[PDB]
Structure 1
Amino acid sequence: KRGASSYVRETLPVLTRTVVPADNSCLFTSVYYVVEGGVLNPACAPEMRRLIAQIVASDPDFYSEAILGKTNQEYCDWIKRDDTWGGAIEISILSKFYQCEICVVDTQTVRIDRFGEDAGYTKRVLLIYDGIHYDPLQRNFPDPDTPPLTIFSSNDDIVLVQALELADEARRRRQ
């Protein structure tokens, strides 16, 4: 029969995805979810786009065509549209605003893209990206009381270890 006495069971916290709506707002909704401590607000994008436009218009010395791929005013008009999709340029701006490292695991390349890698921020948050859609990641614990965590120490590299595994498994399921 079974053998239940011949081993010691172990468990640890794991990272899990929380799914946000599959629309062009997903970057903004995912970022809000993790910097807010794990709370979905599907209406956050217009305020976040306005914030990004304010930041970019206020620093044209930095935010030029070479960075934005559009003129500074053209970019600001563009980010304020309700139909545009966010990406790396906006994640970099939001990382600086929130003063938080944003680590995006990419399931197409099995790599983490770290925004704020050298900034000395004390916290990091994680998203997962498949080339079109972003979702937020959180740490779930193996106990019934601890709520999920979305904001990590920037010295916590366990989350990076686990995120990469999740990306690798996703890319293998895709293949």
Structure 2
Amino acid sequence: RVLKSTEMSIGGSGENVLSVHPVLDDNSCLFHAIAYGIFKQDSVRDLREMVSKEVLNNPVKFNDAILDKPNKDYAQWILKMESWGGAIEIGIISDALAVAIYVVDIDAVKIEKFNEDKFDNYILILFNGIHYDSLTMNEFKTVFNKNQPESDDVLTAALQLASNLKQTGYSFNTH
């Protein structure tokens, strides 16, 4: 078989395939992407609220300068379905679910890791600059473990996939 543009071979074994799992293009795609990786059953409400809660409950770490916004404002703001999640949400969600979250950054051709040295299990979400999707192996596995050999083959696959997607113009970016 010949792979689709959203797919990438993993390792030389030839059995395994990494692929984009596209999520709804609304304003909460970051949450769809994480929810798919971890719960495989869409949640956005629960995810937004846990971020907002953690923010309220620790104004010292998440102080106004860190947040670029008054602690109380951001807690309210991130509860709105039109508010775009980003690094701050990822960090909190990662902590709270004891799973690392790796952003496969298409425009940068880099992988930005969150909590990779606290948690050995991780998911991959695919960031095209304005949108998030999820990444699966063989369309059934979404949680990987950085201590297994498969893991490097997977990360290598993610990078090539990112590279292919950037080349074919699915990148966009904003800064």
Corresponding residue of 2:52: 53
From 125, 135, 139, the equivalent of 2:137 is: 139
Question: 1:20–1:40: 8 Å Cα contact kept in structure 2?
Answer: no
Question: 2:105–2:112: 8 Å Cα contact kept in structure 1?
Answer: yes
Instruction: Label 1:70 to 1:153 Cα distance change in 2 as closer, same or farther (>3 A).
Output: same
Matching residue's letter, 1:55? E
Instruction: Label 1:59 to 1:153 Cα distance change in 2 as closer, same or farther (>3 A).
Output: same
Question: 1:139–1:149: 8 Å Cα contact kept in structure 2?
Answer: yes
2:86 pairs with 1:87: yes
Matching residue's letter, 1:172? Q
After superposition, where does 1:110-149 map in structure 2 within 5 Å?
110-119=109-118, 121-140=119-138, 148-149=140-141
Partners of 1:154 and 1:55 lie apart in 2 by 27
CA-CA distance at 1:10 after TM superposition: 5.6
Which segments of structure 1 move beyond 6 Å, counting only runs of 4 or more?
none
Moved more, 150-159 or 72-81: 150-159
Question: 2:103–2:126: 8 Å Cα contact kept in structure 1?
Answer: yes
Partners of 2:13 and 2:96 lie apart in 1 by 39
After superposition, where does 1:1-175 map in structure 2 within 5 Å?
11-36=14-39, 39-41=40-42, 44-119=43-118, 121-140=119-138, 148-155=140-147, 156-174=151-169
Partners of 1:163 and 1:40 lie apart in 2 by 23
CA-CA distance at 1:66 after TM superposition: 2.7
- Percent identity of equivalent pairs: 37
Question: 1:101–1:154: 8 Å Cα contact kept in structure 2?
Answer: no
Question: 1:52–1:90: 8 Å Cα contact kept in structure 2?
Answer: yes
Matching residue's letter, 2:141? L
Question: 1:95–1:102: 8 Å Cα contact kept in structure 2?
Answer: yes
Question: 2:102–2:113: 8 Å Cα contact kept in structure 1?
Answer: yes
CA-CA distance at 1:65 after TM superposition: 2.0
Give RMSD over aligned pairs.
1.6
Deviation per residue, 1:55-110 (Å, 9 max, x gap): 11111111112321111101101101121111111111111111111011011100
Partners of 2:120 and 2:87 lie apart in 1 by 21
Partners of 2:152 and 2:65 lie apart in 1 by 32
Larger Rg, first or second structure (1 or 2): 1
Instruction: Label 1:18 to 1:40 Cα distance change in 2 as closer, same or farther (>3 A).
Output: farther
Question: 2:116–2:122: 8 Å Cα contact kept in structure 1?
Answer: no
- Equivalent pairs, count: 156
Corresponding residue of 1:6: none
CA-CA distance at 1:118 after TM superposition: 2.2
Partners of 1:125 and 1:73 lie apart in 2 by 30
